[PDB]
Design a protein around this ligand. Structure first.
Ligand SMILES: O=P(O)(O)OC[C@@]1(O)O[C@H](CO)[C@@H](O)[C@@H]1O
Ligand SMILES: O=P(O)(O)OC[C@@]1(O)O[C@H](CO)[C@@H](O)[C@@H]1O
Lengths: 270, 270
């Protein structure tokens, strides 16, 4: 024992991760545990460096939102040395790991549907890291909502969940369309931020469209342009995840499987 | 050497700290170091517990945005035991320690002064943790800008740098004046969020006032209501703090003193 828990997250400047980390931290403290946090910046190499670190540091349990390929076995080895591994946000192998995630597919499908009920001629998806399960789930959801859609569709999967990537992708989209799409879905608020930057760089009378995004932000309560938002239940995700690590630690019970937590739908567009 | 560095920060959900931590991390990685982060929630008890943790982890050096008194001798003990301690944001004893901070007093003064030039009939300060050094400097700069001012002045300083606390103070202030102040200065963006919440309960037409805040946010670029902002140079702060950490690590060279980094003034109010 060390009475400390580890948390590997991909982006410190992504407020959802900080929210979850803070939540994990507070609950853990109330249980007599300390939380040590580190970021991999969504890079496999860097995550692996942190792996050996928390392994040697001998934390009692490890929370991780991973970016490693599904074929990667590395966490299996820590788990065999006794280290309970709890996946967050990005699921790990359901046959060996316990994971706490969101209903990404259904949330995405439901997000794209609400935009269709408003006549979209064209519609686009802006996302990142298409190789990750989480993006595939959100892409698949977007596609399911498109069942029998006849308008133009475009999908952009960037190289990172970032504001800059969102700006770049929104730029490519606008050039490919010769103008704004009728509707747009961003798979993360961080991406939506970059989208706003691009809409900003155009005239005021040139920034209007059906908008829907994963996540949410106080900003959206003030923006003239209405935006549908699918927000995580951060507190629930952290509560459920902590439960599992503590059960593994204090009761030597661990049962592989996914625990999905539905996102909350904020419909800012009537 | 463990090739790890530690960072004690007050609030994971304060974007400025998340920003510094990320900057610190990416820079530290490029120099072959890993960064472990932990939060204190601005409580002396929790911070002392983390104290014990990072020394057990025996990190090479420790960054800390402390909430501890000028009468808590804890970082002196740690420092004498050979661990380099480096203050960020909140200064530690300049006789012993090496701190990286903003020009809080001058930033606040310049900020309040910019609101005054509009000749408000009243102006208010909203801050928190009045006992903290950083808070005393910010209240001071505000007071200075106000010399000679003849209008109504209000000062509200809360229990915590939080959105919820910002909301409560704003509500107290409005009941005080029987309406919005003509001008308002917030000492952290996190507090301003609470102010925005309070403003939203009012008609869309009863939300105008001259606003100045510490911190900055993308939202302030899209707001109809312009906001003057003093943004930290997060990257410069982290780079300097890191430079001081390595030198102390790999040269035993460590000269106390305060390295100030000016805030960037975003003057949206004409
Ligand atoms: O969806 P939000 O709460 O706005 O942002 C969080 C998020 O979408 O960004 C991550 C990229 O790593 C996803 O894995 C995660 O669900
Ligand atoms: O001023 P910002 O960048 O919006 O927020 C950062 C900050 O104001 O919040 C902390 C409250 O503890 C201060 O120490 C720090 O300067």
């Amino acid at each position: 024992h060390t009475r400390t828990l580890g948390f590997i997250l991909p982006d410190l400047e992504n407020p959802s991760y900080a929210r979850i980390a803070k939540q994990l931290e507070q609950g853990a403290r109330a249980r007599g545990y300390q939380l040590l946090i580190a970021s991999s910046d969504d890079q496999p190499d860097s995550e692996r460096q942190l792996q050996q670190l928390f392994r040697a540091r001998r934390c009692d349990a490890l929370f991780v939102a991973s970016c490693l390929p599904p074929e990667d076995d590395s966490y299996r080895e820590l788990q065999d040395k006794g280290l309970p591994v709890i996946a967050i946000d990005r699921r790990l192998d359901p046959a060996h790991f316990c994971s706490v995630i969101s209903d990404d597919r259904d949330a995405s499908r439901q997000l794209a549907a609400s935009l269709l009920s408003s006549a979209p001629r064209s519609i686009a998806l802006i996302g990142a890291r298409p190789e990750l399960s989480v993006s595939q789930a959100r892409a698949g959801g977007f596609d399911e909502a498109l069942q029998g859609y006849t308008g133009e569709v475009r999908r952009y999967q960037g190289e990172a969940f970032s504001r800059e990537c969102g700006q770049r992708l929104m730029q490519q989209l606008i050039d490919d369309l010769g103008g704004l799409p009728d509707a747009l879905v961003t798979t993360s608020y961080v991406l939506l931020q970059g989208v706003f930057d691009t809409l900003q760089a155009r005239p005021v009378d040139s920034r209007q469209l059906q908008l829907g995004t994963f996540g949410d932000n106080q900003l959206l309560d003030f923006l003239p342009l209405p935006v549908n938002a699918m927000a995580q239940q951060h507190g629930q995700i952290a509560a459920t995840a902590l439960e599992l690590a503590l059960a593994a630690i204090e009761e030597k019970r661990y049962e592989p499987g996914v625990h999905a937590v539905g996102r909350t739908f904020k419909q800012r567009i009537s």
